[PDB]
Amino acid sequence: GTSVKPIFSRDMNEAKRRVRELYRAWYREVPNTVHLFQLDISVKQGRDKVREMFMKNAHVTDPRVVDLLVIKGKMELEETINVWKQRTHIMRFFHETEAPRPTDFLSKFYVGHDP
Amino acid sequence: RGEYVVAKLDDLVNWARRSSLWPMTFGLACCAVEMMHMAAPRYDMDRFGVVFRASPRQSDVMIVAGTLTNKMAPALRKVYDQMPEPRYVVSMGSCANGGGYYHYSYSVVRGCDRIVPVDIYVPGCPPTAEALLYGILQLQRKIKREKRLRIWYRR
Amino acid sequence: MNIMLTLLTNVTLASLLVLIAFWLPQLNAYSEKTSPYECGFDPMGSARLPFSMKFFLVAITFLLFDLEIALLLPLPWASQTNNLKTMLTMALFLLILLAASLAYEWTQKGLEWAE
Amino acid sequence: TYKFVNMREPSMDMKSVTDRAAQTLLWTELVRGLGMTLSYLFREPATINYPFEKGPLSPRFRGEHALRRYPSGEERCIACKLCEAVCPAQAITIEAEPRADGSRRTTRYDIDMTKCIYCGFCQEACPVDAIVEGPNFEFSTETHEELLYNKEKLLNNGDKWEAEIAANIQADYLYR
Amino acid sequence: PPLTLEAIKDRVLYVLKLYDKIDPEKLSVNSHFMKDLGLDSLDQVEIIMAMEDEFGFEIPDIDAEKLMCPQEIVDYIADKKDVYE
């Protein structure tokens, strides 16, 4: 049960090692993608956003899972730099069209009967 | 008076616009081959005065024909954008009309009108060739009942 | 008197014909409408790159070929000379050298231009 | 069994090569094409004059849906609810209710033309031939709303095309 | 003019406090990232993106896990570039 297959990394140490340089690539690209995709957002909000999706799953301990998001996250940086994706495909991450969802208990209660 | 003169001028523009539109069928699915079927000598759009014209900067009416997916969604809109005015889109088939047979799937936007301002909705799965020919006829009848110059006169 | 007058008339005919084709239709262009059309998808930024050699190679061969044919326009009046034998030999020379230039260009690849 | 499609034996006699040189020099095969299309032009066309004449159809044609009624005139529909259960696109929505007489039919028969796919399964599903789908195909429109047919719209259309579909199922129910 | 060790020091610290979450008062010679400067392991993947544009070079990831303090950066460039004062 505990003994299992190393898809790409034995230990969580080399898991971050795969996260590191991929973040470096996912850090370097921002000025060029923002340039040729012809957006309006600034580079810095692109930079701190890259942090944002690097954050939500920064809580798993299984080495296979984390490096599975490594290849998962490896799979859009080229989908962007070879202009395969669209402007609608990277503004999608910049969730903008929806009104701010409710955070306080009062706001949920006012809106409707749904947790 | 000026109303009569502008009425004739509007009709003069009206007659050509309802007889010289050049459709661009954005071939998507089994609905598209039907539009090529009403290109066959059986129906022959060109006898009405319309020609299948690519380079949608030349076309006037553009026909979505088949299911429309999210992958196809953003490009299809841009085809509508640089399509010069006057521009009209005709919904070919149930899938382009309201998602049709795939209305519940995860990858097709329910109805093409969610992306572009559909002018004529043509039902069918697929709409038989002359049913679309009927829809094109309805387009010219609707084109006949416009008041572009008349509205500007009262503007 | 009439020659440039004929030239003058056509140019005005063309210019007014585009003039009433430009101001009359009540230009109503937008940003997306004026955006370049690339098979309905995003342009990646181009049309500013060299194109190997084949298009250039044929252009120069055409230019060189066009120059030799320039040498042999006056043949219709050349046939009216008093000494045909010299003219017959000389005109034949230009054509066979025109052949030889084509012959070499054919043999050493050449017209089978690069890919 | 099988047969080859491109095993070609070009005979290398002086006769045959003359035709090959004749073929290449004088565009004989290209002229064959010109005379081929010319014969087509000298033929009649087959462009039907729509709408002054329309395509040839069949009694089994599947077109626009229309709920019918008995010779007495009461709606054939009894809300057995078979048609939506087989409807491959779930375009049929319906809720039955008690009626004053007790012949409790449906208060809702809404078929979404932009979801339906015109398989004709509804006809085969209906045990009383209530929902049939008529021969009409001109029911185009300009707004998406008018394609969301409701119980009233089907009933009106059934009363409209009643003259046609009655003979269609009359001449086709033996096949069915 | 060879890039001096002090020049390595001032350049390294310069963009380090140009980074948002480093305070120049807290910045010092012994400005340890996680403990003193209050950074994290992935936070270190910013200032190495920030030191690269100074001298126009590149450094691998096999060392990025040992430069936790500005002197560690300063000495490392000195030996690998082999330029001193």
Ligand code: SF4
């Ligand atoms: S409406 Fe029917 S025929 Fe047309 S594309 Fe959809 S499934 Fe195919």
Ligand code: SF4
């Ligand atoms: S033909 Fe009848 S059963 Fe089939 S999808 Fe349409 S309404 Fe439903």
Ligand code: SF4
């Ligand atoms: S139309 Fe026919 S199949 Fe549909 S609910 Fe009524 S009786 Fe049943």
